[PDB]
Amino acid sequence: THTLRYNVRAHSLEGSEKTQLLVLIYVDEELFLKYNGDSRETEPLGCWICARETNNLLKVEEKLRGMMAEVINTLQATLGCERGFWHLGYDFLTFDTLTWTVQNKMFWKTHAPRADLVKTFLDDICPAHLQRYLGPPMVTVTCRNYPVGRVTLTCRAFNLYTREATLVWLQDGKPVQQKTFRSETILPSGDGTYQARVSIRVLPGQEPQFSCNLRHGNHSIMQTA
Amino acid sequence: THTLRYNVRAHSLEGSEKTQLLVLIYVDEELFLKYNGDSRETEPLGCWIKGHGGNETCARETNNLLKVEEKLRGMMAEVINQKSQEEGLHTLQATLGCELLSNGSTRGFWHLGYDGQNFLTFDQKTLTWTVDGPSTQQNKMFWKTHAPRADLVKTFLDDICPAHLQRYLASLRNGTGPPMVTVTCRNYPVGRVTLTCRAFNLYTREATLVWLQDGKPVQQKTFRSETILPSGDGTYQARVSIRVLPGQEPQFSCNLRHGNHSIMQTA
Amino acid sequence: IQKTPQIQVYSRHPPENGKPNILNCYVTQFHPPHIEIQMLKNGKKIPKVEMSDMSFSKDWSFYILAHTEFTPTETDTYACRVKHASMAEPKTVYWDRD
Amino acid sequence: IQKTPQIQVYSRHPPENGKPNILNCYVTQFHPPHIEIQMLKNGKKIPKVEMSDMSFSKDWSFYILAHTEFTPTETDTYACRVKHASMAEPKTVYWDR
């Protein structure tokens, strides 16, 4: 349910022609950390939400670089957590059983990263990294005597830390309508947080029976009309 | 909000009468009028304006410009005379004008430059000249008295320049196409691909270009009056490049912001 | 092939007349990636409008967030006007507080 | 006291082989104002080069735009060559893409 993914490519630095890894780190499928040792006018250390992280980033680059020293000597690789995975190549090789799945077999099997060091990284060291990487919302309700013969109730949730949310209209505690928000339906507030909105029409006089419930993470928040 | 700016430069410091001046007039950072008193110039006057009656407007406003050059010469006569005494070749510059604020009020300014460095600055609040560089008290007092008379300066900046700007803005109102973006690739240097994003047909000198990798900015540049590239036809352009590894190009997109436009192109 | 932009206009924080706030114009699901966005107060153009970087969605479409500082009142109207090649005419969406 | 010119060379329009265009040579941030600018085609000086008035920016440094008509081809090379008291030797900047 949570995914850490390293995307790495061998490359040489302009000055001394030794090899480093350009690494891209994706937590939950979004670009999170970046180390480009051969940057020129761009930043070698990239982070989007740190400094503590970028310090570890340099360390995981060498760790990964060391593990793949033999095959480094256009090599690219993608690896990560959640179950682990590790693929290699000049794009063909996969860490299946603690062995590597591809004359081609003889060369790859020999040069491949040690299965011991690989299993440990995927089983313990990488989950820890993913673990390391990993006020309240507020709800308002407004009412309008509109349209004719109806009252419109509008529930808005502000200050959502993530883009997942459920808003429920309840009538005397009975769920009436529900909306679960996705990506492309959740609203960016523009300050890093997200917001959502559901509305409902009721008969005049029904309003005091109605309440709005926000479920977000471990938050369950009530607001009456 | 609008700005009128006079960029003035003496060609060579002879004296208050014989010193020839280049005067360039900018409205909202766009070159509008020119007077060049250089004897070796075949076209001493210039006028950049479009639309109907443009030629008549140039006739009027280049003639008006001649009067402005007279006033500027007069006000700066003593500074010119004193600097003309200096041995060797030196450069006297001035920038001055006024800014119309959206609340209808006016902010004036007047700076002098000497040999490419800040020289004097007119203090709007104080109504006196400030010596900008390191300076003895003797030299400060000296220039405070030989710089353009404060009452003349203030009338020009508070009354005359704003009236000119207003007259210019009316003649300009007679105001195309959208901006465009291109992306090119080159296998350079040796083990890299240089991605170059260019924005063309910018109507003003304000724009931002950003290279994006998976939605995240990897290179960003904001272009302004003095960093944006003149295309030469009255429109502007901009450029940002990055180096990536071969095969990475699909990951990168260039996003232009200009005025109300946002345009993105993927490599 | 072209997709018509959806436009949503809303305040960053719960609105209160006389209290400084941010008005968002969230423009989604359009294609091609060329949009023109204007924000209006009482029918007149707002000078300073911020735009986020344009983003790509998985449904093969683009989106962007524009916004401007504002102080809501009872009588002032606000709107977002959008031009895009998928539309013959500019589309205007008024801020509705509810 | 002396400021070295920055030299940028670029087409007015997106370049296409065989199509008439304009090559700009934008020289900025220099002082003193005296400068020599030449535009080159295959190493040789291009006779008709237009030049803007030399203006200056907020920090007083000077700028000027030189340009010439050209039709880009696959084999023709273009450059801008600039001489200024701030530099020992003439600086040459080639056009690319």
Numbering used by the authors:
A (entry chain C): 6 to 54, 63 to 86, 96 to 104, 112 to 120, 124 to 128, 131 to 136, 143 to 174, 185 to 275
B (entry chain A): 6 to 180, 184 to 275
C (entry chain D): 1 to 98
D (entry chain B): 1 to 97
What does the study report here?
Notably, an unusual basic patch on the α3 domain of MILL2 bestows HS binding capacity.
One conformation is essentially similar to typical MHC-I molecules, whereas, in the other, the α1-α2 domains are located distantly from the α3-β2m domains exposing the interface between the α1-α2 and α3-β2m domains. MILL2 is the first β2m-associated MHC-I molecule shown to form both open and closed conformations. These results demonstrate that although MILL2 associates with β2m by the same interface, the molecular packing between MILL2 and β2m is less tight than that of classical MHC-I. On the other hand, the tight proximity of the two helices formed by the α1-α2 domains leaves too little space to bind ligand. Interestingly, electrostatic analysis also revealed another large basic patch located on the exposed surface of the α3 domain in both closed and open conformations. This region is composed of Arg194, Arg200, Lys229, Arg232, Arg247 and Arg251. In the crystal structure of MILL2, a SO4 ion from the crystallization buffer is located on the edge of the unique basic patch in the α3 domain, proximal to Arg251. Interestingly, binding to heparin by the basic patch on MILL2 released β2m, indicating that heparin-bound MILL2 adopts the open conformation.
